[PDB]
Amino acid sequence: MVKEINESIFDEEIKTEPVIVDFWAPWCGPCKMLGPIIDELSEDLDGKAKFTKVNVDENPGIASKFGIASIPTVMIFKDGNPVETLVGFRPKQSITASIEKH
């Protein structure tokens, strides 16, 4: 349950438990390694966190607004505010540990 989001619906999806945004591109190797992790966590942390994906090729405005200078980057939002920016590939346990903190 990872929802693909764009600038038009970004505000809606972000304000709603922590919301995780995976900034990715289909041509980026490390991003493709991260995809399955985010998918698995959307099930394992179901009821605890919400997961979404932003394709930076199609949403350059979102990427610039949040300083996504490198992909993959995973951002955590709480009450509509960005509270964590996780740059670089990380295993499942590392992402979970970060989400657990909020």
Side-chain angles (χ1 to χ4, degrees), residues 1-2 5-6 8-10 13-14 17-42 44-52 54-64 66-77 79-91 93-100 102:
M1 171 55 53
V2 181
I5 59 177
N6 61 27
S8 72
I9 69 172
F10 187 88
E13 302 289 10
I14 267 38
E17 71 190 38
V19 181
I20 291 72
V21 182
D22 177 18
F23 292 92
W24 74 291
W27 46 261
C28 180
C31 288
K32 283 174 286 198
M33 289 306 321
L34 241 195
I37 293 172
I38 300 301
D39 291 335
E40 179 170 330
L41 286 183
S42 66
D44 292 335
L45 301 183
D46 188 16
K48 298 180 181 176
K50 179 182 176 182
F51 299 77
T52 63
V54 169
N55 181 341
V56 299
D57 292 352
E58 299 175 351
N59 303 282
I62 301 176
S64 59
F66 297 108
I68 306 305
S70 186
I71 55 171
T73 284
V74 173
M75 267 199 71
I76 302 181
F77 287 78
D79 297 327
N81 295 124
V83 295
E84 211 78 49
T85 302
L86 309 171
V87 186
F89 178 88
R90 295 147 190 257
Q93 291 71 21
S94 177
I95 303 290
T96 300
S98 297
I99 298 171
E100 289 184 317
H102 295 73

